[PDB]
Amino acid sequence: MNVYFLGGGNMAAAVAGGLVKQGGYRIYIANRGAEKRERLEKELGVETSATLPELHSDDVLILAVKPQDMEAACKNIRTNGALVLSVAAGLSVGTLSRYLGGTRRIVRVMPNTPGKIGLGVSGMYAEAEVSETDRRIADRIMKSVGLTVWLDDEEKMHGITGISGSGPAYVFYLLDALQNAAIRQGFDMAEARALSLATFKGAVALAEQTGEDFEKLQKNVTSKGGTTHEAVEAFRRHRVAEAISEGVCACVRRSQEMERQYQ
Amino acid sequence: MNVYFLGGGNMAAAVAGGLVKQGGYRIYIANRGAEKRERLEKELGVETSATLPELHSDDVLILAVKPQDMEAACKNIRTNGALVLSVAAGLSVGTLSRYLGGTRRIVRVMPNTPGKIGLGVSGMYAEAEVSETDRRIADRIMKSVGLTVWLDDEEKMHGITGISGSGPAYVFYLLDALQNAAIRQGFDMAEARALSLATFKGAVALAEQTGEDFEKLQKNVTSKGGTTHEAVEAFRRHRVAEAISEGVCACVRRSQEMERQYQ
Numbered sequence: 001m002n003v004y005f006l007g008g009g010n011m012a013a014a015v016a017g018g019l020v021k022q023g024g025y026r027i028y029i030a031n032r033g034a035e036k037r038e039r040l041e042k043e044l045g046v047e048t049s050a051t052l053p054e055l056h057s058d059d060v061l062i063l064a065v066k067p068q069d070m071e072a073a074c075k076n077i078r079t080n081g082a083l084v085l086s087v088a089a090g091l092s093v094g095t096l097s098r099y100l101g102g103t104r105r106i107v108r109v110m111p112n113t114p115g116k117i118g119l120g121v122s123g124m125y126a127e128a129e130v131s132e133t134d135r136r137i138a139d140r141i142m143k144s145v146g147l148t149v150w151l152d153d154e155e156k157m158h159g160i161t162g163i164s165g166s167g168p169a170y171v172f173y174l175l176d177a178l179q180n181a182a183i184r185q186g187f188d189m190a191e192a193r194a195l196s197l198a199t200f201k202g203a204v205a206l207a208e209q210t211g212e213d214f215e216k217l218q219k220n221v222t223s224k225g226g227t228t229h230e231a232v233e234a235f236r237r238h239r240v241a242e243a244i245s246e247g248v249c250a251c252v253r254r255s256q257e258m259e260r261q262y263q
Numbered sequence: 264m265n266v267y268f269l270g271g272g273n274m275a276a277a278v279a280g281g282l283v284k285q286g287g288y289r290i291y292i293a294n295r296g297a298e299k300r301e302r303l304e305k306e307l308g309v310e311t312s313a314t315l316p317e318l319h320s321d322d323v324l325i326l327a328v329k330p331q332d333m334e335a336a337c338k339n340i341r342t343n344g345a346l347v348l349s350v351a352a353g354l355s356v357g358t359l360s361r362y363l364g365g366t367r368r369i370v371r372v373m374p375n376t377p378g379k380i381g382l383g384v385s386g387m388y389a390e391a392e393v394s395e396t397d398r399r400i401a402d403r404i405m406k407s408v409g410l411t412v413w414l415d416d417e418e419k420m421h422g423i424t425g426i427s428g429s430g431p432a433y434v435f436y437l438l439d440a441l442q443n444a445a446i447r448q449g450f451d452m453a454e455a456r457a458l459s460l461a462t463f464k465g466a467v468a469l470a471e472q473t474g475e476d477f478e479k480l481q482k483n484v485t486s487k488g489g490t491t492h493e494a495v496e497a498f499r500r501h502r503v504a505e506a507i508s509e510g511v512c513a514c515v516r517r518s519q520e521m522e523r524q525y526q
């Protein structure tokens with residue numbers, strides 16, 4: 001089964017690479033610039049081209065261009081009833097339908113950048129008119145790069161952005177936060193980075209393996225009048241977790257704003 | 264080579280389990296309570312006992328009882344010049360020396376709880392009088408459970424506590440913070456937990472694999488006027504990273520306080 005990508009950038013290359021490891025797809029990437037077709041061909045060994053070939057109802061098309069270039073990109077594309085996925089932000093299924101001239105055979109994806117390493121999380125959404133078999137085809141495609149999470153309401157696609165879409169940046173911010181607290185305690189940049197990385201990696205593996213509630217895990221290791229308690233009381237006083245929720249709201253507000261730009 | 268543990272609790276059981284996987288040590292755990300000797304013997308298959316046997320200069324002794332019970336535990340122990348490690352908090356090498364009646368053959372360890380799963384970080388400290396070969400013996404012991412970091416100054420053992428010692432609790436707190444922001448966005452408890460876990464696990468793997476600066480990684484994925492930028496501007500306004508450094512200071516202050524209790 002053919003999987004065409006419209007757009008040869010990072011997300012396209014993550015999912016294409018994903019599909020190559022999975023096996024049994026024919027990958028093909030339309031991308032206007034030669035430079036980056038050169039890379040894909042050398043690294044993944046996928047076919048590429050400046051334009052798409054004729055599509056058929058038995059193909060998949062993955063739309064992977066930046067949102068603002070999407071209407072132009074889709075302008076003269078004839079899907080011929082192919083299954084369409086899109087990974088572009090802020091472009092609703094109805095907007096996508098318009099762009100492509102009426103087809104409803106569309107699944108939306110909100111992936112994130114650890115998918116580049118097979119650790120992604122992809123929010124997924126399809127209207128009711130989209131068959132279960134098409135959902136399953138889309139779902140196995142996005143599972144080549146990580147976790148899928150299907151949503152009932154297209155609106156929750158903003159929640160995904162707020163949590164898993166932009167969340168890796170929050171984690172980088174918090175890694176850096178801990179690295180910097182380590183430098184303040186007298187560690188050189190090398191130790192402070194290693195400390196912070198290993199701290200996060202090991203706490204996260206513990207949470208994963210136990211499946212215990214995050215809060216239950218925090219409390220299990222915060223005896224009253226002890227060192228951990230002093231730190232987490234400071235976190236609480238400065239409303240750290242709350243500010244995290246505020247940041248998420250500001251992110252989801254802005255995703256909502258941005259989406260009104262094209263519908 | 265024999266490795267005796269004084270204390271059969273969680274840290275003792277983590278490092279013993281570590282040593283079993285490594286291979287080639289004879290593990291033996293003194294622990295007064297039967298109940299928990301029963302576990303260790305069934306799970307790890309290590310010898311245990313209520314008391315220690317006669318020790319020799321060719322043994323290792325790992326001191327692993329709670330700090331306040333340590334002076335009593337060591338009261339009638341004769342190390343006979345055995346290499347001693349201690350994983351107890353807030354008990355300096357000099358204090359340990361007193362406790363054991365003058366020996367200087369001591370390496371201090373500040374481990375953390377992901378060592379339970381081979382993902383630990385252990386701060387390490389020895390006085391100058393402690394030979395390189397003894398440091399290396401201690402260092403291979405603590406490497407059975409994760410990363411080691413050797414320090415020049417015993418004082419930095421408080422910095423380790425502040426960063427890697429208590430840090431897993433901070434990560435649980437921040438996992439929960441993100442989980443809660445997800446619930447506020449309309450996800451059920453199951454999705455919110457999975458979202459948050461996978462977000463942290465995948466960002467951390469990305470940071471690890473790239474080795475790129477945490478801040479450089481955050482900025483790489485925070486285009487101006489975009490969704491991520493709104494969130495991280497909120498984080499900055501509420502001084503999240505700073506409060507993290509404050510929490511670390513409060514933790515390290517308290518570790519310092521607690522250590523004055525026994526010297």
Ligand SMILES: NC(=O)c1ccc[n+]([C@@H]2O[C@H](COP(=O)([O-])OP(=O)(O)OC[C@H]3O[C@@H](n4cnc5c(N)ncnc54)[C@H](OP(=O)(O)O)[C@@H]3O)[C@@H](O)[C@H]2O)c1
Pocket residue numbers: 006007008009010011012030031032033034036050051064065066067069072073074087088089109110111112113165166
């Ligand atoms: N980071 C995330 O959370 C994540 C999640 C969800 C969605 N996304 C989405 O991923 C998409 C791209 O992101 P990216 O980081 O991968 O950006 P990118 O590297 O710039 O990829 C976009 C590519 O589209 C190509 N393109 C534009 N018009 C074309 C045309 N009509 N024919 C063939 N190719 C064309 C461009 O290639 P040329 O150089 O030849 O012009 C460009 O390289 C966006 O829609 C974004 O919303 C990212």
Ligand SMILES: NC(=O)c1ccc[n+]([C@@H]2O[C@H](COP(=O)([O-])OP(=O)(O)OC[C@H]3O[C@@H](n4cnc5c(N)ncnc54)[C@H](OP(=O)(O)O)[C@@H]3O)[C@@H](O)[C@H]2O)c1
Pocket residue numbers: 269270271272273274275293294295296297299313314327328329330332335336337350351352372373374375376428429
């Ligand atoms: N979480 C961390 O960051 C980490 C890091 C560094 C250090 N530590 C240290 O780890 C040590 C123990 O922590 P834990 O969580 O493992 O506590 P724990 O489960 O209570 O282990 C302590 C054990 O010592 C035993 N014990 C006391 N007196 C004894 C005696 N003299 N003879 C034989 N056994 C005796 C007790 O066994 P009984 O039931 O028989 O009395 C008890 O189970 C502490 O010193 C702490 O400072 C933890």
